[PDB]
Amino acid sequence: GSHEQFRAALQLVVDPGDPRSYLDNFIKIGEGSTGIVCIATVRSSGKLVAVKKMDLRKQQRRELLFNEVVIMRDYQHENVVEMYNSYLVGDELWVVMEFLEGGALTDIVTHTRMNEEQIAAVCLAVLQALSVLHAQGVIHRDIKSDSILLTHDGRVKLSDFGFCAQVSKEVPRRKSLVGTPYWMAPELISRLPYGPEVDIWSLGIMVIEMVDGEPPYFNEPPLKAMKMIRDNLPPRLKNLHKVSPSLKGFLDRLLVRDPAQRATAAELLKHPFLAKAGPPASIVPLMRQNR
Ligand SMILES: CCNc1nc2ccc(C#CC(C)(C)O)cc2n1-c1ncnc(N)n1
To answer: How far apart (Å, rounded) are the C-alpha atoms in residues 205 and 101?
Structure first.
């Protein structure tokens, strides 16, 4: 009944029907937290959408599938990927969403060197999303360059809420070992009760990606890296001398070991470093087709 129960539960939240009957010409474009992502054409209108597809039978933790469709149900923000609908297709949960044509930030940080104007623009956008998400008690729990998608004109959206979690008065903190190792907050690796603060640390690591091209310890096996994150001082930038005093001071508010001292998203929105933030157009030349 285990499988049948998850199906029936999903059936009670997803939209009715088989979306395959309304979509043409599927093209696989990626792989996320809990399933693959494809784009396709909405036949009636000619518009392109993306679809995340999560097989119930290939999950380590099936209850994660509730995250996008329960926690993130009809969530709307200029810096969050817009989801349209969800469906149950055989054993797969499908989430139909807008197509972000600029791809992911990962492709940018692995192939180019962002300037601080571009870095600030990305941070500002993510912090705006996080302040609102955190205000509602949602923790993303997998902030990294992979989770950042871009429009053609350089606007930035937070993506892949497959691992997100809800806190509340009754569940003030989460405890589960969730994330991507190199980006994990120290308190989360130490298996202490944690909150929204973990997203702030992870953003700090994403800043290190934007500067160094990869998170710290990236060439170590993941378990060793987590041990190193857990036990050592905050990671240093390899290219510290290429970073302005403003960027450093900003980053120093993020990579704080003690989560109680770590700046919050709302606090960070006031940081002087973000005044440097360029417009959406500044990001454009970094994209693959433009470089
Ligand atoms: C870089 C490949 N594209 C891609 N990978 C994804 C993984 C997870 C989610 C995701 C997710 C949710 C928001 C359902 O949690 C979305 C992904 N996308 C992508 N690419 C272009 N447009 C769109 N919309 N998505």
So the answer is: 25
